[PDB]
Each structure stands twice: as C-alpha cells, then as structure tokens.
Symmetry: C4
Subunit: 355 residues, 4 copies
C-alpha cells in the first residue's frame, strides 16, 4: 500500500521463454494431428534451445564480474539446458525425446530470487515439520487401520487391504473427498467425525508453520535490504539509536524507471518519499529537481491536503517511501527534526516556485 514498484521486475527473457517453450509440447502429445504444425513448433524448441544456447556461451564467459561469486546455481541448469535435449535427440529416436522438456522448468527457478528466500527458513524451522510429519504419519496409519477392521467382509473389492484405506485416509484427511469408494456401515461412518476435525487442525498448524516465520524473513527482507540507503541521507547523523528499528520495518525501497510518474498533483496527499539516488521532475514554475538524498510530502502531510507538485520519474530513481503515521511517528519521535521539517514546510513553499 505504500510503495511504487516499476521497471520490469519480471525482466529477463530467459525467465520468459520457459513458458512458451513448454506449451510447444502438448501438440506432439495428441493423436489424429496433421504433421504440419507438429514439427513447426519442434523448431521453437530448437529456437529456445538455440536461444539459451546463444545466451549460454555468453554466460560461459564468466570473466564478467569475476572477483568473488557463487554461480554454481545459475550455471547448474544452463549446462543441462542444452545437453539433455541433445543426447535425447539421438538415443530416443522416437518422438518421446521431447519428454525431456522436464528440463527448462528450472530456468524460471534459475533467476528466481525469492526461491532462495524460501529455502533459507526451512533449515531453522523444519525441526517442527518433521515431528509433525511423523505425527502426520502417526495419525495416517493410526486411523487408516481402523477401516480395514470393518468393511473387509462386504467390501473386499475396495477395503480388502490396508493401503486401499490409507489412500482413502489421506483423501479423507486432506480436505479432498474424491468419491470413488466410501463406506456403507454406521460405525465406519462414525469415524470420519474426528478426521476432518483433525486434518484441518493438523494443517491448521502445519501450513501455518510456513507463513509463521516466513513473514519474519520477508518482514526482515525489508530491513536487511534497507539498512542500506540509511547513511546516504545527509540528515541521519542525529537519529536516535532505537529510532531506526522502529521505522525500517515499514520502509520499503523500490526503484522507478525514468519517465514514469511518482505522485500526481491534486491527488489526496497520503504519503511522502525519500530520494537517495537518481533525479525527479518536480513540476513547478522553476523545477526543483532534487537528486540523490532528498524527500517530499511534508508540504502535503503536515497540513493533510492534496499534492503540491506533479513529481514524476525523470530518471531511474532508487526510491524509498513512507505513509504519514510513521512520519507523524517521526515528527512525534523528535522535536529536533520537525524543526527543520517546519523550515522545509516553509522553504519548499517559496522554494518550489523560485529556484
């Protein structure tokens, strides 16, 4: 609610072409298909093959930025990105070779930031998951057995064995309800009463384990990435020690590209930003182009009014952002700082029109 993300977060075309490449697959999977388009997209494999293969050697030139790097992941696929279809092309002489389109599926995961963010937390908290995972296996067979107790007599064909019910156990426990084979007696139907009661309570925790400290990491992601852009601000030598921890939880940094808009004039003033790198277009008679290490919105927030200037993204700006309350927090947190933001709320009135 407080951030302006722009400039192609879904940028790399390597990330893009995994999708069309795999939709090329299915037409080969279908009988009664004319051969025209059958091979027409087989080329497109050779394209994306050739395309990453074109990208590939440029990556194998890893003399770029070669000081200290960890590119075992980013290379791990690019090797097999082209070799696996190639050997598949020959030995699997039949068309089944294209079933080695199970290969590009990591290419999205290649430059998938937020996936290392995933695996980071599991190696602290999966301690829980295991004991739950065991406990899941406990309750699975602890409960799955109770059905073999009963309908083995008149449902041999369905419940004549154990795993046939362990099947129906999880399908019954895992919120699903397929509906191929269901009991007929009373007491067997009694038993389900605690099952959905369980599996929703079980995963009531177990799935909850995930968002539990995942949120902490992501709530932490906006600090670890943003204890940067702190000393850059020339004013923040005087901020109190514990002041920052109170603030940066809500501060997110994102980038805007050149030419875009940042805040339009006359819209209801709801937030203020800190510039730390780049430049803007403060739409005024004399444009007050504030570059790295600036801010704006106190003109709108102290008074609680619409906007005073159509600030637009003149260049690619590494932006911060901030809603009122946490600036009201700052105004509340320090009379020393509102002194200057009082002056700023007067300087930028005349200084907006003047040079």
């Amino acid at each position: 609610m407080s951030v302006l993300p722009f400039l192609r977060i879904y940028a790399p075309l390597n990330a893009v072409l995994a999708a069309p490449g795999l939709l090329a697959v299915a037409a080969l999977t279908i009988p009664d298909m004319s051969g025209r388009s059958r091979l027409a997209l087989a080329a497109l494999l050779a394209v994306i093959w050739g395309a990453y293969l074109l990208q590939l050697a440029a990556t194998l030139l890893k003399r770029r930025a070669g000081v200290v790097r960890d590119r075992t992941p980013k290379i791990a696929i690019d090797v097999l990105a082209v070799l696996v279809p190639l050997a598949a092309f020959l030995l699997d002489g039949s068309p089944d070779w294209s079933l080695y389109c199970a290969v590009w599926l990591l290419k999205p995961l290649r430059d998938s930031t937020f996936f290392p963010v995933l695996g980071r937390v599991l190696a602290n908290e999966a301690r829980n998951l295991i004991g739950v995972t065991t406990l899941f296996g406990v309750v699975l067979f602890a409960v799955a057995l109770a059905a073999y107790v009963i309908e083995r007599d008149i449902q041999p064909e369905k419940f004549g064995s154990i795993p046939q019910a362990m099947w129906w156990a999880v399908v019954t426990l895992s919120t699903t309800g397929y509906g191929d084979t269901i009991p007929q007696s009373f007491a067997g139907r009694v038993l389900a009463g605690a099952v959905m009661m369980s599996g929703i309570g079980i995963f009531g925790l177990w799935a909850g384990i995930l968002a539990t400290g995942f949120y902490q990491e992501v709530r932490r992601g906006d600090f670890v990435r943003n204890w940067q852009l702190v000393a850059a601000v020339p004013l923040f030598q005087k901020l109190g020690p514990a002041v920052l921890v109170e603030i940066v939880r809500a501060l997110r940094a994102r980038t805007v590209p050149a030419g875009a808009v940042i805040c339009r004039i006359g819209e209801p003033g709801d937030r203020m930003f800190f510039v730390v790198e780049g430049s803007v277009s403060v739409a005024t008679p004399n444009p007050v182009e504030l570059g790295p290490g600036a801010f704006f919105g106190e003109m709108a927030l102290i008074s609680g009014e619409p906007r005073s200037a159509t600030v637009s993204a003149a260049t690619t700006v590494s932006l911060l952002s901030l809603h009122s309350a946490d600036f009201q927090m700052l105004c509340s947190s320090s009379p020393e700082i509102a002194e200057i933001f009082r002056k700023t709320a007067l300087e930028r009135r005349g200084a907006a029109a003047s040079a």
Copy 2:
C-alpha cells in the same frame, strides 16, 4: 467489539438494485415457461435501466462539488450502464440481449468503498505473488507431467495426454477432489502424498500473503481516518507525542444516527466514548446534553460499575469509542490527565443531576 456502527452503511439504492435486477434474468433462461411473467420482469430491466438512467443524468450534472475530483471510476459504469443494453436491445434481436446483464455487476462495485482499499496493497506485495505464481506454475507442470509418465498405457481415454493431468493436477492440488478420473496403479497413487502436502502449504503462504498486510492497511485504516477528530478535542494539547500512536490503533470512529441509543443505563459499564461532533441525550433529571467535543464513561470505568445514564443518540453524532484498558492505559500513561478525570468523576456526579 468496541464500536457502534449505525446509519445505513449499506445506504445507496444504486448499490441495492443490482441484486433484484439480475435475479430478473433467470426466468428468461428456462424452457417451458409461459410468456406472462417472461416479459413482466423485462420491464424491471427497463425500470432499473430507467432508474439508473433517471439517476444518470443527475450524475452527468457533475457541476456539484466541482472543485477538484476524481470521478473517472464513478462515471465509468454509468455510461455503459444504459448504452450496452440499448445497443444490445436492437442488434441482438433475439432474447439473448439480456445476456448483457453482465453490466450492472460493477454497479455494486461503483460505490464499493473497501474495493479501492483492496487494490491499494496489491501493488506493493504482488512482487511475492508473482514468484509464487510462477512457483505455482512450476509445481503444477513439474508434478502434472509425472502422471503422463505412467497411465498413458491403460488410461489413454483419461490420461492419454498432458493437460488431461494438469486438470487433475490442480483439482488434486487445489483441495478440491472432483472425482471423475482417478489412477489405478500403486506408484501413481504414491505421488499424491506430497501434493495436498504441497497445495495446502503453498496456499498456506499464498492466501496468507493477502491477510498479511491487508490487516496492516485495515489496522492502518483506523488511523488515517482518525488522525482526524484529534485536535477537535479541546483537551489534547497536552498529550505526549508517542502517546497517540499507542492509542489510535484501537480507537475506531463511527457515526450514530439521531434517535438511536448509545449506552443504556444499568447495563454493565464496559467502555467510554469521545464525542466530537453532534449531540446526545444524557438521561438525567437535568439532561447534560454534551455536544461536539465531549466524553462519558469514567463515572462507570474507574469504579467498574453499571451505567449511570441512558445516553441516547439525540442527533447524528460522529462518535469515537474506547474500552477500559486503553483508558486505564491513558490513566496509567499520565497522572496529569487523571487529575481532571478525577475531577470529572466528581463533577459529573453532582453535575449529572444539576444543570
């Protein structure tokens, strides 16, 4: 638990008539129907058409409050609210024109506040959703493929292709369990063990992404809307800077209409209110009608007793509200203020009966 919402939050009849208008549809959708009521409700389309169309031109008079406004949304439907049925009435000479009752469905969304509140946060946090959305697509086809590996032999008619399983993938992953086509072998049935394990863990996060900072915005909604009604209170020049941030998170403001009740006498005293605009009916021998900028309940909360007066909504009051603890917080937070609320807890004892 701490607020008195009244005065027709579901007020505008424009919001109302979307519902009956669309229930007018279905009778046309049914064979063996006599023509009597068939067209009888076709009028009601012409009513609601005519009704909004009556409202319409009054809205096209946008010389009301015409200083600075953003009514591109509120007009966006009202135009097509009437044009689309109209052109549909002629060119679709057959009765199918009423299938352009897909049009009014934004009219609830027209004056749906809390929908802009929805879209506000997605443009900060959907960064996550995409990488999850990709990751969802990863795990979809990463897993959907594994079924074509197997039952292509003896289930051509069901699993003779890829998307036939991608269907069964999400139906299996998305907690659903339709139950038309299910495997027969062992190992294919092994594979589901991690699927519900996944999709509940996947959406264990992904849905959790939504309420995550949505709650922040709504927890923020009760500050941004309520840093107003702060300086209105004549007593709040002395409140400490950080004092307010501690408080306003729980303070919600709502309005009561005239004539209603606010707190009845003798009920267990559980909360106190701040009046800032309007008037009340302090049911006492001499009614102490406190107008804009007042409060009541300290008579009930310091002692922890039932109510001292049947305060009733005499006029339409922009109300605040407050349970004890956060007033005990305030009483704890400041001895300077309990001094006057000690006096108030004595003045309003004699001043309740006297003038």
Copy 3:
C-alpha cells in the same frame, strides 16, 4: 500452557441433557422398527421436558438475585422449551411432532458463555464482511455466467441454465468438488484456474477476518476479567503504571477445586502462581497454608530447579498463574521488588520447614 483449569467448566446439567435428548430422536425416524424402544425414549423426551420443566418453575422464581439483571436471553428458551412440544403433541397428532426437537438446540446456547463473546465483535467488523459478501456475490455471478456461455449447446441437461452453474460455481469456488456435472471442453476447463486461486484467496481473507480481532477480544478477555484480582494483592501499590499492561496479557485466572493438586514436588519448576482467594496445602513439615493474597515459585524459578513443595488444592482457590520469563520480566522490570522476592527466596526456605 500456563494455567490450571478445573472444577467442571462444563457443569450445568441443563447444558448436558440437550445431547441425549436429541439422540432420542433418530429411532423414530426409521422404518421396520419394533414399537418397544420406539416409545421407550419418547418417555425420555417427557423426562427432559419434565426435567427442564422441573428446573423451569424454579427459574420462573426470578426473585433470586433480583436487583439488576438481563435475563431476557436465559428465559427466552425455557418458555418455548416446554410449550412447543406441548402444542406440538396435540395438533401434530401424527408422530411428526417430535420434529419439534429443533427446540432444545438453543439450550446448550442458553448457558453458552463464549457465544456472547462471539456476537460482540461482529458488530464492529462485519463492515468488512458485507463488502466482501457483496464481492463474493460479485465473483459468484461474474464467474458463474461464463459457463452458460459455452456448454449450453451440448450440456443442456446440466448447463442449460444459469443457476445450474451458480451451483457448480460455489461448489467449484468453495474448495469442495462434489463431482456430479463437470465440463468437457477446453476453454470452460481453462476457467477454473483462477477459481480455486480466488476462493482460497477470498476466504484467505474472509475467514481470516474472524480470527483477526476475535483473538483481540479473547486476548482482551484475559484483561477485562483480570483487572480484577489486582488490588487484592497487598503488594501491588508500588507497581508502575505501564507495568500492568505489559503483564496481564499473559496472566490468566482460573479456579481449582478443593482436594486437587496445584504443583507436585520434584517436577521441573516451570512457573509460579499468585493466590488471591482460597487456601492451599503447602506440603512441608509445618504446612505453610497461604490463604487469600499469596504466591509461590520464586524458590523454584530464581534457581531454575524442581519444585520445593507439593502444593495441592486444599480449598477452591481462585488462582492466577505465571511462567518464568514474565516474572523474569518483573524481576528485570523492578529492582525494588526483587529485593523482597530475594527475601522471600530466603524466608520461605526456613519458613517452609518452620511455622
């Protein structure tokens, strides 16, 4: 994890007999049943009828505690508890009268505390639910329509109309998957991809709305019920103002009955309690029976050791309870208080064995 709830929280037999009374129903609902037990439990209706009816008149004596009360709820059922079967007994001369066993179902809800706790919060927050409820209805028919677009041709018998799909809409949206009527084409099967994506995201919020501030109320329930038992402690004149708000969130009060155990000796010392009303059995050579307004566990917690005495519930004690950290918080929060709890950790060493 920090509380000892005992003394029959599920106490009143009025709450109990709703359950057996309704299990009396089903035997009448079944053909090929001999008449012996058919009427045998019809008596048990006359019992529970007669039983509450016996309780009833004692309740109609509402001259007990008749000073100020709100018993419109608790009477509301007791009236119809007996009248509705009675008039049902005659006019419904056929056995169907017992279908007015839809009546006792409020009797659990009669003395169901925690149900007023439920309805308390909805009248602050259902503002959200409505706009979501509308939005649910938006997405329902917004999406339900798209199926009538398609399979009306070759599924008249199933999708020959609108509500036949609105049925399949919610069954598809609401996580369920019945599996009677499912599409056959491609594009109609494409559409489900956003549905489970939606309904899990929709109720990802909407159900989340419930626990959102419900937890606040229940987290508040342990303060509003426990700003009592505060001044009772003779030591708490010196506690700081903001000190209590930090503490009482974790403090829960419950009662133990006489004769029970409170903490057994030699078990790992993990918590300490505050007595405020009742008496105990401090199992020592000279039993140090501490009555209203006492505590114990600092002997175990400062040292971090097993228990020093088999404290057992001698009488019915209105107990508090407290784990270490929040007492370490208190020890950390105040050196003035650890002074006496240092003395207490020495006095109760010799005073435990001596008188």
Copy 4:
C-alpha cells in the same frame, strides 16, 4: 533463517524402526501371495520385537541417572512393545495376530519431544474448543435437520432419515464434497450457500485456535530453553534488565557436530554467532580457536561485507546465532558495548593473523 541445526535431530534408531516394521505388515494383507516373502518379513517383526526387546532390558535397567525422573511415559510402551505381540502370537493362532502392529505406533511417540509441547497448551485453551465443539454440534444438527425436511419424499433411499444427512452435513461442511448423494430440488440446494460460508468461518477460527498460542509456546520455547547460555557469557553482567527480553525471542540455540562447517569465508556476511561451549576452527594463518564463551561476525557486520574466516565446527559446539538487525539493535541499545565491539572489530583484525 538464522540457525544451524545439525547432529542428527532424528537420531534414535528406536524412533527409526517403527517405519520399516509397519511396512512389513501389508504383504500379509494380500491374497494370491506366495509364502516365500510372506514369512520372510515375519522375521523382521521378530527382529524389531527382538531389537527393542534387546533395547528393552537395558532400559529396564533404570539404575542409570536414577536420582529424580519421570519415565512413566518412556516405559509405557516398552512394556507392551513386546508383550502384546507375544500373547497375540498364541491366542490369535490365525495370522491376524499381526493386526497387533497397532502397537509400535507409539514408539515414534515414545521419544517424540514436541508432542509434550503439543499437549501442554491444550489444557489452557481447550476451554474455547469445547464451546466451539458444542457450537460445531449445534450448527451440525441445526443444519443437518433442514435436509430431512425436504427430500424425504423423493429421496427416501438417500435422505429417508436424519443421520444420512448429518453425514452429508459434515461432508458438506468440512470442505470435502464426497459426491455420492446430492439434492435435486431448488430450496435444498439454496441451503448450502451458508454452509461452506460457515465451516470455513468456523474452522477459520477453530483451527486458528491451535496455531494461536501454539506459536506463543514455540516462541516461548526459544526463551525457556535459552535463559540458559546467558550468564555463561562472561560479558553479560552489564546488560540492562529489559534488554534480554527484547533479544532472546529471536535468539535460538542449536548444536553443530565436530568437523562440520559453521560459516565459510567469502560468502556474504549476514549473521554473527555466540559460542558458549565447544571449540571451532577459525581458518586463519594462526588459528584463533575460541572455545566456550565467544563470538564472531562483528568483523563482517559493522562493515557489511563477506566473511573474514572459514569458521568450521572443530568440535561439537552448543551454538547460538544472531542476524545483524538484532545486533544493530544491541549496538543501538548500548554505546557501552559497541565500545568493546569497536575494539573487537580492531583486535580481531590483527589478532586473527597473529596468535
């Protein structure tokens, strides 16, 4: 995200052999099976029987650590671990005796820590669960009845009675959707609209009850287990009282085994650790082997740089761990302590290469 768990958390082979022992079962459950492998795994029961039975008597030697213990749980299964198959072996002369493989299922739960952690909290909070559990039973039969109202006429075979719908009630309420018997009329199909609305809102709370304070206990688990390793640090005589409560919530302690790696050089410096027991391999020209009561990472965190030394687990170290922010918190929290960590950030520069 901040911890290094190693050394076989899933250690005891008693915990291990429950799994293979029960997979031994199913082959006996299957007709048309040759007798070769039929009995081959019957031995493996005699193995695991004999195996725990071998472990058993060593456990019955409970003269180990026999000072004060509570081993009623850990013995509770080991007794029946061997007796129940044994008596089952004879009296159940038919092969059904192996259906007493319902016995080992507690053996995982025998040494399942985190299961006592489960049951700890339920006896504080299940107060809620009951009133919800009742309320679940309310809404069950309150709603289950409404179907018998209707389709008794034309669905006797399916809805000719009450419990046949109570079945369909929970299957309809519990998110499941089996799909054997579904209504046909309009109004009966109307009724489901509030059901999924309910059960997802019901378990929207009820499952939420579990993670609610479970998280508190687990968030508490990392303090109660870690108010230890506090005074061990020779530097923590000067820490402020409330300082620790702020910190230890994030501090988790885990152990590394000998030989493992702790932090590798050149990786991006993201965290620092506190050693309190054990020794390390500070990979430098003169290895600065810091033993019990040490730390490292300030060299990497004040500057925000990669690692300065391949610290590796020389011995089995009871480790702590800490990301930056909470050390930046500490650096912010105390200028007295950054004084020494300024010196440490200079001493360990020259002291890393020197002795």
